[PDB]
């Protein structure tokens, strides 16, 4: 409800040292190679939706681990090719896939795919639980980079871009990526791991500066990590777990992004604390802007919606 | 903190109609057949533990879906065969597997294995997430009995009994099952699905009378189901989910338990509401006793521990 | 979080006696006469908005008590006349007037004005505070129907319809009204007080069955009334206040609605309790449907948005 | 419940720069001139009250904007003239005007008037809502000094002194002002804006050091300002709003007070944070004392009541 | 915040069977005999207090168990004899003995003593803790009527009346008793155990219908009893504790009150639930009135203070 | 739930100046002399308990102020002498004396006595309430060292050691002391005041660095002191109360301990804040180790149980 993290003057210069291990780049190269071995085999199934001016589909494709990934895909009912958006959603926060949002993005003139996150909403997570974990997804497979939950998720997010760009009706040169919280971290991960996106808008991105997040966050879900360490108390487990996390920490991916990025942060956000978002932002080495909202937390920011629409119109239209 | 469910006189006669589908028995027969196809291949690894009078091991075996299930196994350091206990734990509630508790059970004279639940603590869950679920395990695979989370868990609980009974140092004719909440539901399930247990103690059992649970509970984790319906709103989804749950509802399993049962319930328990526990109890057709504690909720009840120790001494020693 | 009001079978037949005083109709006739004395003098000011396919304006008009009422007005950028919607907002719940929502309604093909409520957001409330009130608007002027806050608000809601219907680009025979909570009460009030609307959608309407609302609600803002009685304890004050409220209670207005109505209610809604909404619904004498959502409270219900879009497409297009 | 603001050693030297604009003095001169144009036309109406030794009245007078302002006025039943007190009340915190308190002040020998704040309790607020505001009074008319809620309130508080001093039975040379929270800020405002008061006692005064208050407060009602900025997000609105506030910030008025002042602060007060009260106190340039209570918050402090009674006896008797 | 106990029509006829044991009267006769053995030896020590019209003292006397009981005693500074009041305070709710309140009672014309409760504030509790109890006083000595905390407290309350009536300046034929919650229970107890009071006012009395209180209360301190049963689980302990409590339950004492009684209850009071207060009220057989306040809980009710002052003026002056 | 106190690097060097008054040592010498004047007169009463391998008793002895102190005493069913433990319990936190814990300690091979704290559980507190105090035991008799609650408690804890060591079956040279929170402070007090213990294990000890605890604690029960100062506001009372506390503050006793000490602290513990525990630890001048658990609060720490068992096995076996 109120200020809690570092003061803004300190946030502005907050830039922790990268925590990427020596084999970080090799890990991601190998991961993308694993993804490439699965044929996408995309399937569009039309959907009845109560609107004119748009055609709505259920898009399904195959991704890492042969997982079936799905979401709503909405297209302007006009001759293309169209600019496009892949939209990523918040942690445990998709209610029937946000169909109405995707439709509205299409009515704004974007062929839009709302990728649903494996295991959270509609999409399948074929990765196993190798060692047991705290309630939630944050510590699933955390003892090894190869088994960690977000490995499959990040690869799915790249694959979404490969699939949508392959469509005749989408202009592969004008694709944006967007989302908030988990959706914002997937936005930054996708732009770091794929050359497809032309521009990125990330609301208060999650999955950033893990070492600080678990010490400063006051709400879920970063605190699932804390919960995992309570239930698995070995000092060696904690060291391994933090190392695994560092391959997915968007502050370590951020220097790979080479397109324009617009980002938001609300200063009272206790879920994705300001410091962790400034850390990601400050590691970006690209055309970038951070919109800071003093009185907002982990939530829809109306002013930023205006910024987002103007940014995508500028870069994709 | 205070009374909230049906008054006692109503609880005493609360016996909802069974919700088991016509193919309930066949489903369990077929699930047991799938388990039987997997060779247990038990492995005992000695552990140095700071106590005399007991030998402590890490026990691992294979179960449904080729899952590696594990736990601490503690044995009186004296000539057997010994009476034995399989102990099941609460939802998301195992902290390094309760090694100290298992040791204490062995110092009480019982060869004791604390089965750790697949995906929650140490043990592997090889079952996939076929459709996306609310945060937690309660709705994992809920759209099909064959994929539902507790299918594997129940089978693992049966497999624990098969493994322990097979050891030379355990008297297979004097094995008890116990646990609280999730652990109490697994106790009833194991006693319903296996002829190995001689007697059972279930503290405030979970996984009971789901249709009422989701309408009366005031705390997690029954409300994960509610969360899943919020995120997946189709009426047909809800019907299917409840149908799936009815195969695992211990009130439907309860009439298969043929051994003595001691059960508890705290009348201010908002997690496993009294009415849900009375439903399970009232469907038992076996020697049974329910201990009702007016002033306790979802928590350790000292007086019931005395009852439990006395019950197992009576039946196993 | 959980069920709390009357069970469904009771809600279905919950129809309290109307509380309208004998001079209820005359009061409304006289209030409409006062409104009619004020020339609307509508003013449209174009806005640069970052979307194609729509024209966006700030619409201002004059209303009861010479109040300046305003909102965003968005129009499909194509040849009219267009179907139209007047959208009303929740209590204290407008953030810069929902400009993005109004634009989206226009991209769906509806010339749409989001009336901002006098004193809450942008619009002027010229009505005085004659006697002092509890924090909020609910008890402002409550000691006299003529001075009560929602007198002006209801008249402004009627005036919005008169203004929009008067535009050349709007088809006056295909205007809908919609809104949630306070916005849903205004929807019903506008449909009761004006023959202009063709159809109405009200999400969980507020301002209904006040005598029950203040005894069953568990959250703000019905409880402002309770707060006012705490601060102004005279028995005669309470009688007068409830009397005032009965002129504005939508259950008393409901039988004047002559167009099709779609309504929602979440069964765990502690703000606009189910019983209060069923009362309004059950007093409608018109083509109507109430969508009941077991697992939702006072919040956005995705499935109802689909229903709403389908309803307006059916009735307006 | 616990310490939260600056440590006491830092509080003691906390004295922010004044934020008064260049036309601050002219604004107040003009405001008082506006007040002077309204004839007070005071009216005393006797009241039945169950006590001997006091006569109780309802005092009504006209003030700025022709507003009817009222409150209970209690007088020692003995020949005067009497020393007198004007008592001001907390935000939204008067329950039927605190008649029993006023009577007790009269039994202590003071002709006492408890001014009730326009719009909050009994008294009329004739000032309009020019632009819409967040729930409450704190942001009503905040975009212009001339329309801002506290302009009328402060002028009413001065007018109360003019009215009571005009009574034959009150000794105009022995009038105190007192109150807590909002009542304390009105106390300081009245003593800064009027030469009538002889002495002032302010409990934990509100309306002080606004820039800090909205960043440090953890309870209502300072946080209404934050709420207003959430709903009206333009950077220019925020700058205007803070400027308007600065004409009413008692830290800017405080250097005008020329009578003895006694003030209290509780160190755990999260409504009127210690720092904001120290700011007001430290800007006083008069005979002054601040009583600091480590273990008290926003509440009645028994020890300070003793201090208050002794202070008024010293200065008014 | 909201209605929760039996509806009013049920409260009005709620009259549980008395729970007094067969030796209830003899216990009280014997307890009064024990009190009588202790010479009161009253001591008045003048206090300098900053008010005219009253003389203020610290009054100390000896009571049951040779306990030193004390409080503030304030007297109109004029020729007596005076009507008098003994005021009893709430549980753990005395802050330096309410000196200011006692003074105000004296300025209203009543020689007033605020008995401070042994062990809670200033006064000594010489009774031991014979068996260990839950945090608080409610279960201190609860295993035996002779050792129970409120035995001494009730006797001290009777002794206060004996002491005050013995002063030359108090008219022994015009003494009232008053207090709220714990203070209201002591008011009823004192009126039941002593013929000295002429009339009694009890705000929402505590210590009533214990069997229902511990099943319906939602706040401390009835729930201390529940806490004691959690910590001391023997069924025989609970039976004995409830038996002890029945000697002190004011519903069992109520039919001994022979003077006029005015009582209050707020219908949202979760501390002294309405049903518990109606039980005490309904067992009175004397001139009586219960004032019911729909919108108030366990708190100061301004309107009731007017009733109380009017009642004592009627009966004592 | 999250970090709140000084950062760990600062905790590690946190060592406040001792607050022991000049007569600290003399006070304790005199206190122990008072204890020695009471003959212990120990009594063992056998108990039925459902276990083999242990004999269980109720041990009662007489201590300071002729108080009857009791608890469960469990002995290995084998020929001794045995190593032994005296276990002390948490504030208001013993549920029927933790019989099952004591039995388990005996099954681990220790003759174990769980001393129950006078007035809290089973044991009698013969010390009176001399002046009235806040709800709870923390401020009982706080205005004088001689009457203060913990004087009797600490002496009881020493007497427990004298009694158990006197038993033929216990090896007086191999006695440990242990407990958590209040139990941990009694552990340190007992080892400072008695030469009997061979080794000590204290979980997150309470009763330490009082001046800081009341300023940093965010939960009960340190905050009872704050509550006492609210209800007894004299500056002199506060100075006296802090002085009394300093004779019992284990940071002042700690330098007297001459046996090995193992201690734990959880970094999110808001009951016994990290700083207060580091203060005690840092004043120890003996063989010592502090186990710091980042993710744990005021609760059972499984890893530390392993540390505790290994430490006692090392030092007592």
Per CB-CB distance under 8 Å, the chain D contacts of E313 are 50-52
Q: Do B313 and F50 touch (CB under 8 A)?
A: yes
Query: Chains with 3 or more CB pairs closer than 8 angstroms to B?
Result: A, C, E, F
Q: What's the reported resolution, in angstroms, to a tenth?
A: 1.7
Which residues have CB under 8 Å from C300's CB, separation 6+?
none
For B168, other C-beta atoms within 10 Å of its C-beta total 6
F223 Cβ under 8 Å from any chain D Cβ: yes
Per CB-CB distance under 8 Å, the chain B contacts of A96 are 231-234
Check if the beta carbon of residue C166 is closer than 8 Å to that of residue C72: no
Q: Which two tokens stand for residue B101?
A: 């508790």
| Residue found by looking up tokens 């990523």 in the block | A88
Task: Quickly list DSSP for C70-109.
Answer: EEEEEEESSSS-EEEEEEE--TT--SGGGHHHHHHHHHTT
Burial D92-122 (b: 16+ CB within 10 A, else e): bbbbbbbbbbbbbbbbbbbbbbbbbbbbbbb
Residue in E closest to B303 by C-alpha = E233
Q: Do C233 and E3 touch (CB under 8 A)?
A: no
Q: Which two tokens stand for residue A59?
A: 């898009």
A306 Cβ under 8 Å from any chain C Cβ: yes
Q: Do D223 and A303 touch (CB under 8 A)?
A: no
Of E196, E36, E63, E47, nearest to E119 by C-alpha is: E63
Q: Which of E216, E217, E233 sits opposite B302 (nearest CB)?
A: E233
> Which residues, listed in sequence order, are joined to residue D72 by a DSSP beta bridge?
D58
Cis ω on the peptide bond leading into residue F81 (within 30° of 0)? yes
Please state the separation of Cα E176 from the chain's center in Å. Answer: 13
Query: Residue E81 belongs to what H/E stretch?
Result: none
Task: Quickly list DSSP for D68-115.
Answer: EEEEEEEEESSSS-EEEEEEE--TT--SGGGHHHHHHHHHTT-EEEEE
Q: For chain C, how long is the longest CA-to-CA vector?
A: 60
With 0-12 / 13-18 / 19 or more C-beta atoms within 10 angstroms meaning exposed / middle / buried, residue C147 is middle
**The CA-based dihedral angle spanning residues A194, A197, A199, A200, taken in that order and rounded to the nearest 10 degrees:** -60
For F215, other C-beta atoms within 10 Å of its C-beta total 17
Q: Do A124 and B136 touch (CB under 8 A)?
A: no
**Cα angle D142-D148-D152, degrees, rounded to a multiple of 5:** 165
- Where do the domains of chain D lie? 1-317
Which residues have CB under 8 Å from A41's CB, separation 6+?
A61, A62
* Alpha-carbon distance E92 to nearest alpha carbon in chain F (angstroms): 6
Per CB-CB distance under 8 Å, the chain A contacts of B132 are 116-125
Show which of residues 122-181 on chain D sit within 8 Å of chain C, judged by CB atoms: 122-126, 128-137
Check if the beta carbon of residue B88 is closer than 8 Å to that of residue B190: yes
Q: Which two tokens stand for residue D83?
A: 């020393």
Q: Do C233 and E294 touch (CB under 8 A)?
A: no
Per CB-CB distance under 8 Å, the chain B contacts of E223 are 1-2
Q: Do E2 and C229 touch (CB under 8 A)?
A: no
Most B-contacting residue of F52, F101, F108 (CB-CB within 10 A), to test interface: F108
B17 Cβ under 8 Å from any chain E Cβ: no
**Cα angle F257-F263-F268, degrees, rounded to a multiple of 5:** 135
Per CB-CB distance under 8 Å, the chain A contacts of F2 are 215-218, 223
* Alpha-carbon distance E313 to nearest alpha carbon in chain D (angstroms): 7
Q: Do A96 and C303 touch (CB under 8 A)?
A: yes
Residue in D closest to F220 by C-alpha = D1
| CA–CA dist A121, B133 (Å, integer) | 6
Neighbour order of strands in the sheet with F82-88: F43-47, F54-63, F67-76, F111-115, F82-88, F170-180, F199-203, F261-266, F288-293
Q: Do D132 and C126 touch (CB under 8 A)?
A: no
Calculate helix-pair angle for F99-107, B99-107, nearest 10 degrees: 70
> Which residues, listed in sequence order, are joined to residue B291 by a DSSP beta bridge?
B264
**Cα angle F309-B89-B178, degrees, rounded to a multiple of 5:** 95
DSSP E140: T
Kindly report the backbone phi and psi dihedral angles of residue D249, in degrees, each rounded to the nearest multiple of 5, phi listed first: -70, 120
Kindly report the backbone phi and psi dihedral angles of residue E71, in degrees, each rounded to the nearest multiple of 5, phi listed first: 175, 170
With 0-12 / 13-18 / 19 or more C-beta atoms within 10 angstroms meaning exposed / middle / buried, residue C195 is exposed
Residue in F closest to E91 by C-alpha = F135
Check if the beta carbon of residue F100 is closer than 8 Å to that of residue F151: no
* Alpha-carbon distance E305 to nearest alpha carbon in chain C (angstroms): 12
Task: Quickly list DSSP for E220-287.
Answer: TTTHHHHHHHHHS--HHHHHHHHHHHHTT-HHHHGGG--S-EEEEEETT-SSS-HHHHHHHHHH--SS
Which residues have CB under 8 Å from A264's CB, separation 6+?
A202, A203, A204, A290, A291, A292, A293, A301, A304, A307
Kindly report the backbone phi and psi dihedral angles of residue F88, in degrees, each rounded to the nearest multiple of 5, phi listed first: -110, 145
Query: Residue E176 belongs to what H/E stretch?
Result: strand E170-180
Q: Which of E95, E107, E310 sits opposite D108 (nearest CB)?
A: E107
Residue in C closest to B219 by C-alpha = C1
Calculate the alpha carbon distances from C93 to C97, C182, D55, D222, E312 in Å.
9, 9, 47, 19, 50
Task: For residue C45, give the 3-state DSSP assignment.
Answer: strand
* Alpha-carbon distance B140 to nearest alpha carbon in chain A (angstroms): 8
Check if the beta carbon of residue E180 is closer than 8 Å to that of residue E266: no
Q: Which two tokens stand for residue F130?
A: 């001399």
Residue in B closest to E214 by C-alpha = B2
Q: Which of E53, E95, E309 sits opposite D302 (nearest CB)?
A: E95
Task: Quickly list DSSP for D232-249.
Answer: S--HHHHHHHHHHHHTT-
| CA–CA dist E239, B289 (Å, integer) | 23
DSSP D174: E
D302 Cβ under 8 Å from any chain E Cβ: yes
Check if the beta carbon of residue A131 is closer than 8 Å to that of residue B139: no
Please state the separation of Cα D83 from the chain's center in Å. Answer: 20
> Which residues, listed in sequence order, are joined to residue D71 by a DSSP beta bridge?
D59
Q: Which of E116, E123, E132 sits opposite F123 (nearest CB)?
A: E132
Calculate helix-pair angle for E302-316, D99-107, nearest 10 degrees: 50
Neighbour order of strands in the sheet with A54-63: A43-47, A54-63, A67-76, A111-115, A82-88, A170-180, A199-203, A261-266, A288-293
> Which residues, listed in sequence order, are joined to residue B180 by a DSSP beta bridge?
B203
Q: What is the experimental method?
A: X-ray
Per CB-CB distance under 8 Å, the chain D contacts of A302 are 233
CATH of domain F1-317: 3.40.50.1820
Q: Which of D2, D294, D296 sits opposite F218 (nearest CB)?
A: D2
Query: Chains with 3 or more CB pairs closer than 8 angstroms to A?
Result: B, C, D, F
Burial E236-265 (b: 16+ CB within 10 A, else e): ebbeebbebbbbbbbbbbbebbebbbbbbb
| Residue found by looking up tokens 């950077």 in the block | D235
F217 Cβ under 8 Å from any chain D Cβ: yes
Q: Which of A50, A108, A302 sits opposite C51 (nearest CB)?
A: A108
**Cα angle C184-C188-C189, degrees, rounded to a multiple of 5:** 110
Q: Which two tokens stand for residue D18?
A: 């004044």
F119 Cβ under 8 Å from any chain E Cβ: yes
Please state the separation of Cα B282 from the chain's center in Å. Answer: 18
Of C121, C140, C136, C126, nearest to C64 by C-alpha is: C126
For F275, other C-beta atoms within 10 Å of its C-beta total 21
C218 Cβ under 8 Å from any chain B Cβ: no
């Amino acid at each position: 409800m109120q200020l809690f993290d570092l003061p803004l003057d300190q946030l502005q210069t907050y830039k922790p040292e990268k925590t990427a291990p020596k084999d970080f780049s090799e890990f991601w190269k190998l991961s993308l190679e694993e993804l490439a071995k699965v044929q996408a085999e995309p399937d569009l199934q039309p959907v009845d939706y109560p609107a004119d001016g748009v055609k709505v589909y259920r898009l399904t494709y195959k991704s890492f681990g042969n997982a079936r990934i799905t979401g709503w895909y909405a297209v302007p009912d006009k001759e293309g090719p169209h600019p496009a958006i892949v939209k990523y959603h918040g942690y445990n926060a998709s209610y029937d896939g946000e169909i109405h949002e995707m439709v509205n993005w299409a009515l704004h003139g974007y062929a839009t795919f709302g990728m649903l996150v494996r295991g959270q909403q509609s999409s399948e997570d074929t990765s196993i639980s190798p060692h047991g974990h705290a309630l939630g997804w944050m510590t699933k497979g955390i003892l090894d980079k190869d088994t960690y939950y977000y490995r499959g998720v990040y690869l799915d997010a790249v694959r979404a871009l490969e699939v949508i760009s392959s469509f005749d009706e989408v202009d592969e040169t004008r694709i944006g990526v967007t989302g908030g919280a988990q959706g914002g971290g997937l936005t930054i991960a996708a732009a770091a791991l794929s050359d497809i996106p032309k521009a990125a808008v990330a609301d208060y991105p999650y999955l950033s500066n893990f070492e600080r997040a678990i010490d400063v966050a006051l709400e879920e879900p970063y605190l699932e990590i804390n919960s995992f360490f309570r239930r698995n108390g070995s000092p060696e487990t904690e060291v391994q777990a933090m190392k695994t996390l560092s391959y997915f920490d968007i502050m370590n991916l951020a220097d790979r992004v080479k397109v324009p990025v617009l980002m938001s942060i609300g200063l009272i956000d206790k879920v994705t604390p300001p410091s962790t978002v400034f850390a990601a932002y400050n590691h970006l080495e690209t055309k970038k802007e951070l919109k800071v909202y003093r009185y907002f937390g982990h939530e829809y920011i109306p002013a930023f919606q205006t910024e987002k629409l103007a940014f995508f119109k500028q870069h994709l239209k």
